Design a protein around this ligand. Structure first.
Ligand SMILES: O=c1cc(Br)cc[nH]1
Ligand SMILES: O=c1cc(Br)cc[nH]1
Lengths: 293, 262
């Protein structure tokens, strides 16, 4: 709208999603460093892809310090460039590359708190993210962390209706999705963040399944196989099976041993089986875990 | 439970109220269109209802498309020959936004009886995106209705379907319904549906939520009551046909009340 490509100087390639590549670039007039996401449309025979229609439309609304900021959209006849604020790294690379003796607890706290602020803002604005994972959380040099990659996101109504099944990268996917439930809601994003919290502490994925059924069984062996008492309705869910093994819930202090009482408390509330009892982002912001952020 | 987002439904309602003002078409645009009329638009929307049925699209998709059209026609003059092209592109965009499995472009070309080419549809999709600056997450009548439904005691499916029906009828007639915001039409529809099926009225709990009273809703109620009474006579009938179906509890067959006692 405001910009054109002539004011940008590409610096280097920084990644790629589908539909194309991401470059780091510099605005030649203002000095601003940006990420340019190319979406190729001339190759597309179905016009502008729905992932991009959702990403652009939803990100235009979502203005928050912990959500990656869409600065502009350059729409040529043949190409679409999304101009974003630049952030140097994602949380996955940070975990791998630094964080060899760990992420210090203050930084884990700061990050989780920010992630929860970002997510609460999404939910307050009728948006499910539906792909929260460390690769889609970007950090800058100042200590901020921000939700990114809204290609899988969706504007919901209240109450929710049936949306796309099999969303969320498997390791971060909530049990209600895995059991084929007719409806899912804001709670699926909380589940992902719970997994991410754990992963920040250990630097390994909490539930690294190789399949839908393996993913379920890994959750069950950690949190116990759910029944009607812990999760009313679970046994009536489309892909629940009576033959599921009945694993005992293990002590939660063995799930993430280095984690303190407050951390354990918050983590357990994020990983509650029942989507109705699972803590909201809004409510989690007040958890005692964050008192010293 | 969480499917009703208890912790967010108020924030969401407030935000939608703000956005429906932003996403509002110009009330008087049809008079500024040299070559098209309310009647032509009624034909278009009625056809989009059929298309919605033919492809088993969500009702939300239909409402979004109508929003896109009305905003587009608020700044772009269109010849009658191209009105359907705008509508086809709008329905495509709404489908890509809202549907799990949107129909392919080819199917959208097919339903225009090859009046247009695939290239024309795709170029109009771009133009529509440019004109709306990609602001596609617009509040609809339905987004408000579903929230209002949560104040029923108890829930009644004929009330819900009847309200949806009345809300859809309002899409057809730019005069008078362009003057009313989605949240107001939804309120009028909900009250009228509730009153018709059960004799009850707009509940106090929704007065609390919305700020709207029967006084506030009175003008819209009076138009919507007229629309309901006249609906068998209207030139466009696709919504009545659609809501005869058991999917919507055959609500279009319910008799409208002769008076409202407001
Ligand atoms: O490096 C990046 C990538 C995206 Br996408 C957005 C901001 N920064
Ligand atoms: O391997 C499995 C086990 C069960 Br029970 C159901 C599906 N697949």
């Amino acid at each position: 709208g405001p910009g054109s490509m002539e004011n940008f100087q590409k610096v280097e390639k920084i990644g790629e999603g589908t539909y194309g590549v991401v470059y780091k670039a510099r605005n030649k007039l203002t000095g601003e460093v940006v990420a340019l996401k190319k979406i190729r449309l001339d190759t597309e025979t179905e016009g502008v892809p729905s992932t991009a229609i959702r990403e652009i439309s939803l990100l235009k609304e979502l203005n928050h310090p912990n959500i990656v900021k869409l600065l502009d959209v350059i729409h040529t006849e043949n190409k679409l460039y999304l101009v974003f604020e630049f952030l140097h790294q994602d949380l996955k690379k940070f975990m791998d590359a630094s964080a060899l003796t760990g992420i210090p607890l203050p930084l884990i706290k700061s990050y989780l708190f920010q992630l929860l602020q970002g997510l609460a803002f999404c939910h307050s604005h009728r948006v499910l993210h539906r792909d929260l994972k460390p690769q889609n959380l970007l950090i800058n040099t100042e200590g901020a962390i921000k939700l990114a990659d809204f290609g899988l996101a969706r504007a919901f109504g209240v109450p929710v209706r049936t949306y796309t099944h099999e969303v969320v990268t498997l390791w971060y996917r909530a049990p209600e999705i895995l059991l084929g439930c007719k409806y899912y809601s804001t709670a699926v994003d909380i589940w992902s963040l719970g997994c991410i919290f754990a992963e920040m502490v250990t630097r390994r994925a909490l539930f690294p399944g190789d399949s839908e059924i393996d993913q379920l069984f890994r959750i069950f062996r950690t949190l116990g196989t759910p029944d009607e008492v812990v999760w009313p309705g679970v046994t009536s869910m489309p892909d629940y099976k009576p033959s599921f093994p009945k694993w005992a819930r293990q002590d939660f202090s063995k799930v993430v041993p280095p984690l303190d009482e407050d951390g354990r408390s918050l983590l357990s509330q994020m990983l509650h089986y029942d989507p109705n009892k699972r803590i909201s982002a809004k409510a989690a912001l007040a958890h005692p875990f964050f008192q010293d952020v | 439970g969480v499917n009703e987002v208890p912790d967010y439904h108020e924030d969401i309602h407030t935000y939608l109220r703000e956005m429906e003002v932003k996403c509002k078409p110009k009330v008087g645009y049809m008079k500024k269109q040299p070559d098209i009329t309310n009647s032509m638009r009624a034909i278009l929307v009625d056809w989009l209802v059929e298309v919605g049925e033919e492809y088993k699209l969500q009702n939300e998709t239909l409402h979004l498309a109508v929003n896109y059209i009305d905003r587009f026609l608020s700044s772009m003059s269109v010849l009658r020959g191209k009105l359907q092209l705008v509508g086809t592109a709008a329905m495509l965009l709404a489908s890509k936004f809202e549907e799990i499995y949107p129909p392919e472009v080819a199917e959208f070309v097919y339903i225009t009886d090859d009046t247009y080419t695939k290239k024309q549809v795709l170029r109009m999709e771009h133009l529509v995106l440019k004109v709306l600056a990609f602001d596609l997450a617009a509040p609809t009548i339905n987004q408000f209705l579903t929230q209002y439904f949560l104040h029923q005691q108890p829930a009644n499916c004929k009330v819900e379907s009847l309200a949806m029906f009345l809300g859809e009828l309002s899409l057809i007639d730019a005069d008078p319904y362009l003057k009313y915001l989605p949240s107001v039409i939804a309120a009028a529809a909900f009250h009228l549906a509730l009153y018709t099926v059960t004799g009850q009225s707009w509940p106090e709990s929704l007065v609390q939520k919305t700020g709207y009273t029967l006084e506030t809703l009175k003008p819209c109620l009076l138009d919507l009551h007229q629309t309901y009474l006249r609906a068998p006579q209207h030139a466009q009938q696709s919504i009545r046909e659609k809501y005869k179906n058991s999917k919507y509890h055959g609500v279009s067959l319910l008799n409208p009340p002769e008076t409202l006692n407001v």
